[PDB]
Amino acid sequence: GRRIQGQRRGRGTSTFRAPSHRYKADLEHRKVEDGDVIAGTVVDIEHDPARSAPVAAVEFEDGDRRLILAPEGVGVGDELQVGVDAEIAPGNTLPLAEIPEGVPVCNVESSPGDGGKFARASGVNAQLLTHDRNVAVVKLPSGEMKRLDPQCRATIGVVGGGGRTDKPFVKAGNKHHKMKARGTKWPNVRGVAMNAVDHPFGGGGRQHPGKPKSISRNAPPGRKVGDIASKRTGRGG
Amino acid sequence: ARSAYSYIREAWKRPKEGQIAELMWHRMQEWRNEPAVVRIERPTRLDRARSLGYKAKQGIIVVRVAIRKGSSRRTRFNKGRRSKRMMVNRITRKKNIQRIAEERANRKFPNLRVLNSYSVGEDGRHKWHEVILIDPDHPAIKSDDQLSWISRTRHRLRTFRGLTSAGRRCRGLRGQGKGSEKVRPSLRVNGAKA
Amino acid sequence: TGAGTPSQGKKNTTTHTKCRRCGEKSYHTKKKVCSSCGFGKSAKRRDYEWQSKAGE
Amino acid sequence: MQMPRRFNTYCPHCNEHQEHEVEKVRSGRQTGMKWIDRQRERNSGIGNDGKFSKVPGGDKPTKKTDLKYRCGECGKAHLREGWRAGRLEFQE
RNA sequence: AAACAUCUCAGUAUCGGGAGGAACAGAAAACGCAAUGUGAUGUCGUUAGUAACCGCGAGUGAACGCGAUACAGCCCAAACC
RNA sequence: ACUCGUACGGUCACUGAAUCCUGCCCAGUGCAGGUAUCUGAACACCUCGUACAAGAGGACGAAGGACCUGUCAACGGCGGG
RNA sequence: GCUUUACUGCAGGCUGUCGCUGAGGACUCUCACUCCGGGAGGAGGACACCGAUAGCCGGGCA
Ligand SMILES: [Cl-]
Ligand SMILES: [Cl-]
Ligand SMILES: [Cl-]
Ligand SMILES: [Cl-]
Ligand SMILES: [K+]
Ligand SMILES: [Mg+2]
Ligand SMILES: [Mg+2]
Ligand SMILES: [Mg+2]
Ligand SMILES: [Mg+2]
Ligand SMILES: [Mg+2]
Ligand SMILES: [Mg+2]
Ligand SMILES: [Mg+2]
Ligand SMILES: [Mg+2]
Ligand SMILES: [Mg+2]
Ligand SMILES: [Mg+2]
Ligand SMILES: [Mg+2]
Ligand SMILES: [Mg+2]
Ligand SMILES: [Mg+2]
Ligand SMILES: [Mg+2]
Ligand SMILES: [Mg+2]
Ligand SMILES: [Mg+2]
Ligand SMILES: [Mg+2]
Ligand SMILES: [Mg+2]
Ligand code: NA
Ligand code: NA
Ligand code: NA
Ligand code: NA
Ligand code: NA
Ligand code: NA
Ligand code: NA
Ligand code: NA
Ligand code: NA
Ligand code: NA
Ligand code: NA
């Protein structure tokens, strides 16, 4: 047959690419020689086309002007600080070690200095639970308990824009406009509505999948469709 | 008495033993950070070079070339093929790595011609060979009764036509007797059967 | 809309043009590559053995 | 059917009748060094392996008698045509 | 191959790289009519559809030697300086 | 490529606004987890064999399978008496 | 052209083994190698990656 849609994706053609050229900034923690002295002033609050969430423009003492992954509650004028000795208030960034356990955090680094990887979407947050001289245990929004180097920097507070998911799109048109701001092919045609040549679920006098939908982890691309390595399906039990 | 050279040779018989073993562990680190083709002022295996034709003279160049280890980097078929030809993983190229290295070096020095080459080891995925090239246009070479032969027009691009050291061995021309029926005088003249 | 005559009307785009290297109206001005001599793609001249019968 | 374990009959070696002992031919083990073995290794490569890609024929409903007749005095055995027999059991 | 998978078409078609007026090969870690024998290499004739391969099917397929053509034999590395 | 993205994410699928609802079945097939024991290739190792080698056999045993379990808004099933 | 528990194979995934590969049936370390860091340095570490091979799955493809 023909390569299935999931395979066209990888080639990275226009249709599957994100409108990068239309994006604003790659949100990452600033680099500080040391000392922490680094502080700056919120100059404005903008909309981030890549995350459908607000972002804060900040002017730093040493002249640097960069957009920042804004937590909820940051306003123009506020003074943010980044470093080991940063005060402990929302919007400030400092290593997990210097952060008091029990405090909600966002934009957490996977490894010290990577600029933040975890908890960055609308209204989410990580939860610093345990400290140590060797391991900082954080609970990520997925519920998992992650062990991190206490040297990993983070931002205090939860990400701005919480509750975005609460309102339904209501109409195809709204999805449309959102989708146009992401690296995604939309709308979605069901495999079972295709021809046998286009998808392992395609074909038939009526619409139904050919075999069972749970596919092995070892299935090859072109065949790995449906419920991938499902440990279970349905809702019962 | 033993020539000093004889010692370089002796050392390279077992490149994973003694001092040379440690040198290699050292060098490769820098090599792995170097490019595909790097001209070097002096041959890592002096005895070998000289044995191959190398001379500390103007117009004589040496260069280390890195080549990936393994079989052919082959693309699977995109049309009909009988089972016999649907192969990918086990297919290997008919040209040995040392020959590839010689060609890559030669292309880096369009004006030079390959004289010979020898191996200088390998790690888990590279293989390094040092290629000795010659400037057929530099007097000093044109005037050398032992290398001037490479200046002849008939020798333009020796490597690309397999007239090289490894070139001739890879072509199965080693033996003068049994086994070289489809080899000598050339593979192509023999319908490409060796 | 018919794919024939009615779709022939929008054809006012210029692509292939007189080539600077070979003189054939085969220089694709959009691609900057000659389909006839290879100009723009190859220093060597475009030529294939299939342009003639195998034994000739 | 039944069959005596021992009985008198012609021994092609002795060239005269003598008591023979009947036994079922036990299969010999292969060495894996015969020409066919070397051709299998040699000729098997990428893709289908011609004849070496085939698999075990099948079975006839009843097999023929596969026996060894051993002379009781010279100790040399001889083979005979076999005959279809669903089962063969020796008497004593 | 009266299907077809090994085999065959065929190392063909076609593709990539490159030389010359011709290329390539070439002075034996050869041959092995086993010899008290031959003596660099191409090529032509033959050896021969022979030896060898092969669902031992269809098909595939040399070499030594011999008769010719033309003939040509040398330079490094190292030892010692 | 997704991605100037980070689970309020995005990938892979099924159903197809709302409203009232969505029963029973894990035997087969699929996926997933577990697994005393059984099965399970090659290298290295041991035995025999060979002045070597081919080869025969042993020991060990990964994923996988047997076996057990979970799972149907997973493929699907919901009869005769 | 298409399908599949048709025949035969081929990609791909999983897994053992060998090479890279080092020190003191479970273990520590650091020096290759990998990742993070502008650097200092940090994490990981003889594993992973990559090369070779073996077993299983394998209409994704021929
Ligand atoms: Cl969305
Ligand atoms: Cl050259
Ligand atoms: Cl019997
Ligand atoms: Cl002779
Ligand atoms: K064929
Ligand atoms: Mg970014
Ligand atoms: Mg939704
Ligand atoms: Mg609306
Ligand atoms: Mg788009
Ligand atoms: Mg749809
Ligand atoms: Mg349809
Ligand atoms: Mg299909
Ligand atoms: Mg339907
Ligand atoms: Mg349906
Ligand atoms: Mg010729
Ligand atoms: Mg049309
Ligand atoms: Mg095979
Ligand atoms: Mg036929
Ligand atoms: Mg036949
Ligand atoms: Mg042939
Ligand atoms: Mg011969
Ligand atoms: Mg990197
Ligand atoms: Mg098919
Ligand atoms: Na279907
Ligand atoms: Na050159
Ligand atoms: Na051959
Ligand atoms: Na062979
Ligand atoms: Na036919
Ligand atoms: Na046919
Ligand atoms: Na055959
Ligand atoms: Na004679
Ligand atoms: Na079931
Ligand atoms: Na089941
Ligand atoms: Na068709």
Side-chain angles (χ1 to χ4, degrees):
Chain A
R2 307 154 74 183
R3 321 260 259 207
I4 71 180
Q5 183 157 288
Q7 289 178 290
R8 272 60 180 279
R9 271 186 78 225
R11 298 181 68 254
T13 50
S14 188
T15 301
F16 301 94
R17 266 186 269 138
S20 306
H21 64 298
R22 238 192 287 146
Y23 284 167
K24 290 181 181 180
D26 174 306
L27 310 170
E28 285 179 338
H29 295 318
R30 262 202 43 163
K31 301 166 191 174
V32 180
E33 328 77 277
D34 203 299
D36 143 66
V37 301
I38 287 298
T41 307
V42 177
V43 166
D44 190 18
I45 301 304
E46 324 191 12
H47 168 76
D48 184 359
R51 319 189 306 98
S52 294
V55 101
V58 172
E59 263 197 60
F60 286 87
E61 290 180 51
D62 54 311
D64 285 288
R65 168 61 180 288
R66 310 161 63 281
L67 280 179
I68 248 181
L69 178 14
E72 173 174 357
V74 173
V76 185
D78 297 49
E79 182 194 300
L80 303 178
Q81 314 183 302
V82 179
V84 189
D85 305 295
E87 199 183 79
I88 296 180
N92 281 50
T93 303
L94 49 173
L96 281 170
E98 309 306 311
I99 304 290
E101 320 184 323
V103 178
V105 184
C106 56
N107 194 22
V108 184
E109 296 193 306
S110 186
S111 98
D114 68 40
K117 305 283 188 184
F118 310 123
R120 336 209 324 163
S122 293
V124 298
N125 84 81
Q127 186 53 48
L128 183 57
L129 305 176
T130 300
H131 255 68
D132 192 300
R133 304 182 174 183
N134 301 295
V135 67
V137 181
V138 176
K139 178 185 182 185
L140 307 178
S142 78
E144 162 183 348
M145 305 289 271
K146 189 78 164 183
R147 300 180 115 262
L148 289 172
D149 187 305
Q151 214 41 46
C152 282
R153 302 203 257 65
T155 297
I156 302 171
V158 301
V159 184
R164 185 188 51 200
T165 288
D166 304 323
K167 193 178 191 184
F169 285 90
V170 186
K171 48 180 183 172
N174 295 345
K175 241 289 180 45
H176 173 93
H177 295 299
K178 182 187 179 182
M179 242 50 269
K180 186 163 193 175
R182 297 294 191 275
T184 292
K185 166 65 201 178
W186 182 87
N188 313 300
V189 181
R190 291 129 50 230
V192 169
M194 306 195 274
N195 285 321
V197 68
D198 295 307
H199 189 93
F201 287 175
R206 67 210 143 81
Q207 288 175 5
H208 62 133
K211 306 173 192 162
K213 304 188 308 188
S214 300
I215 190 66
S216 152
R217 245 280 133 49
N218 306 319
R223 178 188 176 195
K224 185 176 292 187
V225 305
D227 315 324
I228 301 171
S230 73
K231 301 183 205 72
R232 60 164 293 157
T233 58
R235 312 188 92 194
Chain B
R2 285 186 59 181
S3 83
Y5 301 121
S6 78
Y7 291 82
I8 306 167
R9 192 166 69 203
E10 203 59 38
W12 275 88
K13 285 188 179 169
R14 311 184 171 175
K16 286 183 181 178
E17 315 284 58
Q19 301 194 297
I20 187 177
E22 192 164 62
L23 283 185
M24 291 302 272
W25 185 82
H26 286 181
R27 292 163 177 163
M28 294 191 176
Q29 294 189 49
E30 294 165 61
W31 288 0
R32 294 157 188 155
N33 287 318
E34 311 200 332
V37 177
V38 138
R39 170 169 177 179
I40 55 179
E41 257 187 65
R42 286 286 176 273
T44 301
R45 297 176 63 205
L46 222 205
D47 67 312
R48 247 292 172 188
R50 295 188 62 77
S51 187
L52 293 194
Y54 170 92
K55 273 183 175 176
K57 185 169 199 172
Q58 316 176 81
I60 292 186
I61 291 66
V62 178
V63 188
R64 181 182 317 125
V65 179
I67 306 290
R68 86 296 182 277
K69 292 169 63 181
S71 66
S72 159
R73 268 62 190 174
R74 189 182 181 58
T75 302
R76 182 168 183 288
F77 62 96
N78 283 38
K79 311 245 197 173
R81 245 47 157 202
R82 57 196 194 88
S83 69
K84 234 283 181 191
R85 312 302 194 179
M86 288 191 211
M87 6 140 255
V88 174
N89 300 307
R90 291 167 177 170
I91 293 169
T92 57
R93 319 252 76 149
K94 293 181 174 176
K95 200 179 297 173
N96 62 313
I97 292 177
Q98 163 169 15
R99 208 122 92 69
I100 301 184
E102 301 194 339
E103 275 187 41
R104 286 180 183 177
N106 189 291
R107 280 186 180 92
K108 313 323 163 193
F109 305 88
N111 64 312
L112 307 185
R113 300 182 176 166
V114 184
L115 185 280
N116 225 308
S117 76
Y118 56 85
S119 155
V120 286
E122 76 190 18
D123 58 28
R125 58 177 172 178
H126 293 81
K127 260 194 192 181
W128 289 280
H129 291 80
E130 264 161 34
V131 188
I132 306 177
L133 302 88
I134 305 295
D135 185 330
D137 300 284
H138 195 293
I141 274 174
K142 294 178 173 173
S143 299
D144 184 307
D145 286 311
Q146 316 184 304
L147 291 169
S148 57
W149 63 264
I150 205 160
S151 292
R152 319 281 184 175
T153 288
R154 286 170 161 192
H155 265 289
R156 294 190 186 180
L157 309 147
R158 330 181 63 237
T159 42
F160 307 108
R161 303 185 280 117
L163 312 187
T164 239
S165 46
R168 280 160 180 151
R169 301 188 233 98
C170 170
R171 285 203 288 165
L173 290 163
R174 283 175 181 179
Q176 293 189 73
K178 193 207 308 169
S180 70
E181 300 83 347
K182 319 255 185 308
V183 157
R184 187 172 297 96
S186 78
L187 289 167
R188 194 191 174 255
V189 71
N190 285 307
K193 306 182 183 179
Chain C
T1 301
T5 311
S7 297
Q8 299 314 118
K10 305 174 185 188
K11 297 181 175 181
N12 67 341
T13 301
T14 286
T15 57
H16 296 286
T17 61
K18 183 97 166 185
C19 172
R20 202 209 304 169
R21 177 208 255 177
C22 82
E24 293 301 298
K25 175 190 146 303
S26 310
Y27 188 61
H28 195 115
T29 197
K30 297 273 189 195
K31 309 169 187 306
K32 297 307 166 194
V33 167
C34 184
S35 65
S36 188
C37 82
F39 185 55
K41 172 201 188 245
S42 170
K44 295 172 173 63
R45 284 276 195 134
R46 170 174 181 285
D47 178 72
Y48 299 90
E49 288 302 324
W50 47 256
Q51 290 168 312
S52 69
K53 283 301 173 178
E56 175 184 66
Chain D
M1 58 168 255
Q2 308 279 73
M3 172 149 213
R5 174 69 69 185
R6 295 175 171 283
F7 68 83
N8 305 301
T9 187
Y10 195 66
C11 159
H13 307 305
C14 264
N15 202 304
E16 61 191 299
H17 272 55
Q18 273 177 57
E19 184 188 63
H20 284 68
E21 188 219 310
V22 186
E23 166 198 45
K24 290 183 174 180
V25 178
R26 293 185 186 159
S27 294
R29 206 161 206 173
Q30 302 198 210
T31 66
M33 290 175 272
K34 278 56 177 50
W35 172 81
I36 198 63
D37 300 302
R38 312 199 226 92
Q39 184 189 39
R40 186 172 196 201
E41 294 179 58
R42 232 203 325 302
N43 291 8
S44 299
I46 297 163
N48 182 83
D49 297 323
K51 61 177 292 175
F52 300 111
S53 287
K54 294 179 181 182
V55 303
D59 294 308
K60 199 72 177 170
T62 308
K63 317 274 186 168
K64 288 175 187 177
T65 268
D66 189 24
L67 307 169
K68 279 188 186 184
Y69 301 85
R70 287 193 163 297
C71 176
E73 184 187 288
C74 72
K76 300 178 179 176
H78 76 284
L79 307 168
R80 288 181 180 183
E81 251 197 68
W83 65 94
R84 298 185 156 71
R87 188 184 312 170
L88 189 65
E89 291 167 47
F90 303 83
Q91 303 194 301
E92 291 191 58

